[PDB]
Structure formats: structure tokens, C-alpha cells
Write a protein that binds this ligand. Structure first.
Ligand code: BR
Ligand code: BR
Ligand code: BR
Ligand code: BR
Ligand code: CA
Ligand code: CL
Lengths: 255, 256, 257
């Protein structure tokens, strides 16, 4: 219930550091949060918004960055810690990454077991993997690009046929990755209602209060995925053997 | 303005707090709030996050401006599934540093029936050249010693498809080769302070320093051809598999 | 120090609003503002974003602390083109979850006229080994039941380049497929606890109140990493195996007749 007046309004915080927080709400602690907004209103149609969720909130310690552009200037977009958190998720995939150069994969000092050749039994299986062209039903419905890849289930049906994986829950090989995700809810702005106020004398006045609703973003679910790079490492090992053996049958027969 | 007085604090009560920006009277195209770890409107002063209004020229933009962007305690995720991307045609990330290889999933979205690689597309993929290259500018500095990169030139894969009638001079049936046109990127940025002078009915002339913001071009309109290395390697795996099978064939027909 | 009083509202007028942090009189090195969705200076209290001042030990750092980071209504983008990165040598993302495969583009940047993979290089590439492994970490927690990954060891590929004269036994490498990085240590100023602070009257009376104590921590010490570009590896492997297939076919076409 305050407005900072000015060309520009300024709030300057003194001390060693400044703190702008949200007290534990008296009557609905589950919605505890601050909404920072570039616009006039509590609705995000009003301007860009960043929302910090209190620990007492349904979606606890959540942050939602809401804008039509998220531009990170002057520095890499990094994880705080090394190799603990990820980009995206099973039910939060980015459509793609646009890169100036090919991804770098590294262990950063972390050490592996002793490197091991692709056992022949595994190669026999890998031969049954199919490299296919496909389309999305959704896309074709609107017209539509063809994509190249390998159906996760296709690799899975093969992993089973060759006894490598029990009919997942878990999987021995990271190239085929199964995940199981909860449902994602969020409390978001709906509209502002009119609320009537009448005194004991009986006169009626109105004010505008915003209405927030809990909304489902996506439901519970599971998913199978693959690691293309892993697939290509295995294909490499695969074909190299097919080349080793073919050059033996070329020699014994040349002479 | 207000100033808040070894640590200053602002506690917001109620169910939630709201800190927002009214609609400017005279320049609603500039509607925004600048949050700064420092005392100056200039980002040389401290890390900044700027929320743009809907009225702003750059509607609902967010600019995070710091010398480190460290996201702690949680994955960096898109709000929705398979609707937003990392980077852009003219907003490329140099790379991603990963502890493991990317996971690609369809999360249950439906695909058409998995189809083999036709022999026509395979004949053509045989013309796709794998190559080494260096960046001219690096070559300006280190010449022969400039770092060497691997890949395939987007345009020459385009040429191969066009030659093999799997594409026309337009601008593609395949996801492996992806073209994009992109708008110019502008922003409003702090440049310098400007001394403004204020003179009253009496001759008196006072002085002050107001900050000037200006509209800067970050990049002009352009277009770009690109490729998905993973898509390239899927076509290759197909290609190379057809060849070895013929190799297997030949061989068999030497023991008979 | 103020409190704003179902919802509290601060509203900034003028063209734009500025909310900043003055230069600290005593400890300018801690200059920063902490935004919190919760009641306390501790992050356990709620999601926080900390903006570091230029004067701060960690100059112009931003720290986003939450249990979810959800980016809505727009791609997560770098401000400029091809100058900043996702993750780092000592700040790696475990993975990226995508719906389609990454797009690599040069956006019009000039290249040296592309060259074939030379025979000398292909020769060496043959010694590169494709292997399997587990993380010494995973095993200490899942034993022989830990996930098995595919890839190559950056060191054995280096040995291959070294043994073939393509690379001096020289941290700076000639090919981008093999990445070496040297990195600084990472500290951060972080809330640890509350302390007992004694207050002595001018009459000698000692009262007491608690205040939050921030402390400097070491997130990780300096170090270095060798890494590889899997894509780069496959580009070379596609050139290698193509030359081999070619030599095999010629031996076939010669065997016949
Ligand atoms: Br509103
Ligand atoms: Br599509
Ligand atoms: Br593709
Ligand atoms: Br490379
Ligand atoms: Ca793998
Ligand atoms: Cl300034």
C-alpha cells in the first residue's frame, strides 16, 4: 500500500546488504510469495514477472520466471554446483538447444571404473537396433518435417530379446533412460473479481481483488528416452567389429 | 524516493507481496523496473535484473545481467513441456558443458510409423562430405595453429539434396537441415549521464545529472542455415549399414 | 527498515523504477541485495535471488536459489550471439532434456574453405577406443548394479594424438574434439547461523540479541578437466569408416574378375 514516486522512482537500500522478503501469511501461508513485475498489475499480461515462492508455499521454494524473452547477458548460464543439477526434465524438455559449437561432455576429475571393450554379446544385440525416419502425427495433421532417430521401445524390445534387460524398472545401460514424473501444479492469476462491501448502516461499495486458481500444468506420467551420443558410441563399437571381421575374411581369401 | 536504513529490510505482509511498475505518463515505451546489487542505474555498478512492462517497446522482456549466472538447488527447466528452447538462430550458446550426454525423449507424443531409409536418400547421403575447418579470425591470429573443428557444411548438404531432387531452391523436408530467418534485436541501454540545467523565473540556473538511456541495435535482421549433428549421424548409421550388408553379400559370394 | 501492509503492494512511478543497494560504508565487499519469497535471510525460508554489487568479493554475481527454476513464455536465451555458454568446466549440467536433437549453426561466420579428413589423421583415429564404464561414485552406492555408460577416454585419445605426432606431449590442443580447461576455485558468501552479540551500555550493563552471521565458503577448489566433443568424435569416425569401406570395396572389386 505504498507508491514510490519519482522520470524514475528509486528505492535505495543501505547497510552491508539489503533484504526484501515475505512474512509468513496469517490466513493462507500456502500462497506465501512475492511477485516482481515490470508492469502495473498482478497479471503477467501486464509485464514481465519473477515470482519467489516461500518455503510455506504449496510449490515450495519455487521460482517462476515469466517473460516473452529471457536474455542472459554478460555471463554463461551455469549450475551453482558441478554435475548435480540438469537442463530440462522428462516432462520439462526444451525443444532444442541452438549452439555455436558441438556440446562438450566431461567428467572434471571424477573417475570411472577401468575402461572396458564392448562385449561381443552386447554387439550381437545392437545389430538389431533400427535407424528410422519418422514424423509427428501432430505435425502431419497441420500439413511436415521428417526426423531421424531410434525408437526407444525398439532398443528396449531388443534389450529384452537378447536377455540384457528384464521385462523397467531399472536399466543397466544409460543409453536407454526411463523416468517417472509427478504432476505439476501451479497457482496462477485467473481474473480480478468485484467484491461488494456493505456497512452496518447498509450502504454497498465495491473494490477489485485478483483471483488466483490452482491449475494443473501436466499430469503424472512416465517416459522412455535414449541418448543419441550413447547410441553412436555403441554403433561405433559395433561397426568397428564388423570391420575387424570383414578384413579377416578379405585377407584369408586374398591369399 | 525512499532509502531504507548492517542490513536493511523490507518485509511484505499478506498472502503475497507485489512489487510492480505503474504505467508511465510520458514514456510508456520504457516501462520497466531495474533491480541492482549496486547503487547505480548503470550495470557497471552491480548485477542487474530488468523486468519489462507489456507497454515497453520490448514487451515483457527480462534481461539478467551479471558476471555469473549461478542457478542453485534445482535443475534449470522450461515451465512447460516441449514448447520453449535453449538459445536461438541469432542467440546461440557457444556450447553446453555436460556431465553426461543429452537425453532425447518424445514423452509419449505420437510419431508416424517408423520408416526405413529409402535407397534414394541413401544414394544422396553418400555425397555428404565430412570436413575439417578453422575460423578465419582465429586464422588471422594463429594461422596454421588456429584450432581445427569437425563437421559438415549445411549448404553443401543442401546442394546434395537439391541435386538428388530431394529438395528445391526454396528455403526443407528433413529436420537434419534446418533454416531460419530472424528479426533484428534491439534493446534500451544506459550510455551516460547528462547534465540538465534548471533555470527559474528569476535568472537563477541550477544544475543536475540525469541518466540517458538509448535504443541500441544488438544485431540486424538475418538468416541462417544449420544442422543437427545427431541427425547427420543417424543418416550415416543407416548409410554405413547398407554398405556393409552389401559387403557381407559380396564376401559370401567368394566361398561358393 | 519497513513492513508493507491478503496482499501488500509497492508501486513505482515514473518511466522506470530502480531498486538498488548503496555502497556499504564498512564492508563494501559484501554489497548485495537478497530477494526472498520467504520471511528470513536464510534460503530455507523461501526461494531467493541475490544480486551482487560491483564492490562485492564476487563482483556482479547473481545467485538463483530455488527448488524449481521454471522459465515461462520464452526460450532461455543468451543476450548476445555465440559469446556465452551453458554450464562450464567446473559447473557442469548433468544432462539436457530435449524433445529434438541440438542444432549447431555458424550463423554466417566465415570458415576456412573446408578440407577433407587427411590420411595421416585417419591413421591415428584408428587407435581411438570405444569403451564402457561406470562412475567410481555410482559403484560405492549401487555396486556392480550401477549404470553403464558409453564413450571414450579423453586421455587415451590424447595418447593417440601424441603417439602420432599430431599433438606435442602442450595443454593447448590442435583439435576441438579434445577439450582441456583450467579453472579457478569457487567461493561464495553464505548464511551459516545466528550468533550471540553482546551489547555493553555506557554504564557497563550487558544485554543480548541475535544477528545473522554470513560466512565465506569454498564451493570447490581450483582444478582442471579433459573433455571431448562426442559429435566431433562421430564426424571423424564417419570419415574414418568411410575411407575404410572404400578401401574394402576396392579390394572386393579387385578380388572379383
Ligand atoms: Br491485473
Ligand atoms: Br516438425
Ligand atoms: Br533429424
Ligand atoms: Br569437433
Ligand atoms: Ca550412454
Ligand atoms: Cl550509474
Amino acid at each position: 500500500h505504498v507508491t514510490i514516486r519519482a522520470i524514475r522512482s528509486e528505492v535505495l537500500m543501505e547497510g552491508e546488504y539489503g533484504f526484501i522478503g515475505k512474512s509468513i501469511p496469517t490466513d493462507n501461508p500456502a500462497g506465501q510469495r512475492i511477485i516482481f513485475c515490470g508492469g502495473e498489475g498482478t497479471s503477467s499480461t501486464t509485464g514481465a514477472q519473477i515470482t519467489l515462492y516461500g518455503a510455506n508455499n504449496t510449490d515450495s521454494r519455487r521460482i517462476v520466471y515469466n517473460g516473452d524473452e529471457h536474455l542472459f547477458q554478460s555471463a554463461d548460464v551455469k549450475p551453482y554446483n558441478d554435475n548435480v543439477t540438469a537442463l530440462g526434465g522428462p516432462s520439462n524438455r526444451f525443444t532444442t538447444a541452438y549452439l555455436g559449437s558441438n556440446p562438450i561432455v566431461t567428467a572434471n576429475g571424477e573417475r570411472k571404473t577401468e575402461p572396458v571393450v564392448f562385449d561381443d554379446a552386447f554387439l550381437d544385440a545392437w545389430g538389431d537396433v533400427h535407424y528410422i525416419m519418422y514424423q509427428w502425427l501432430d505435425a502431419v495433421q497441420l500439413k511436415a518435417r521428417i526426423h531421424f532417430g531410434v525408437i526407444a521401445q525398439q532398443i528396449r524390445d531388443v534389450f529384452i530379446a537378447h536377455g540384457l534387460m528384464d521385462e523397467s524398472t531399472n536399466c543397466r545401460y544409460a543409453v536407454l533412460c526411463y523416468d517417472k514424473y509427478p504432476r505439476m501444479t501451479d497457482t496462477v492469476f485467473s481474473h480480478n473479481e468485484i467484491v461488494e462491501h456493505t456497512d452496518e448502516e447498509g450502504n454497498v461499495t465495491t473494490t477489485e481483488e485478483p483471483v488466483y486458481t490452482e491449475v494443473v500444468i501436466h499430469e503424472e506420467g512416465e517416459e522412455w528416452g535414449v541418448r543419441p551420443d550413447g547410441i553412436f558410441f555403441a554403433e561405433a563399437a559395433y561397426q568397428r567389429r564388423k570391420l575387424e571381421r570383414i578384413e579377416a575374411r578379405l585377407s584369408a581369401l586374398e591369399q
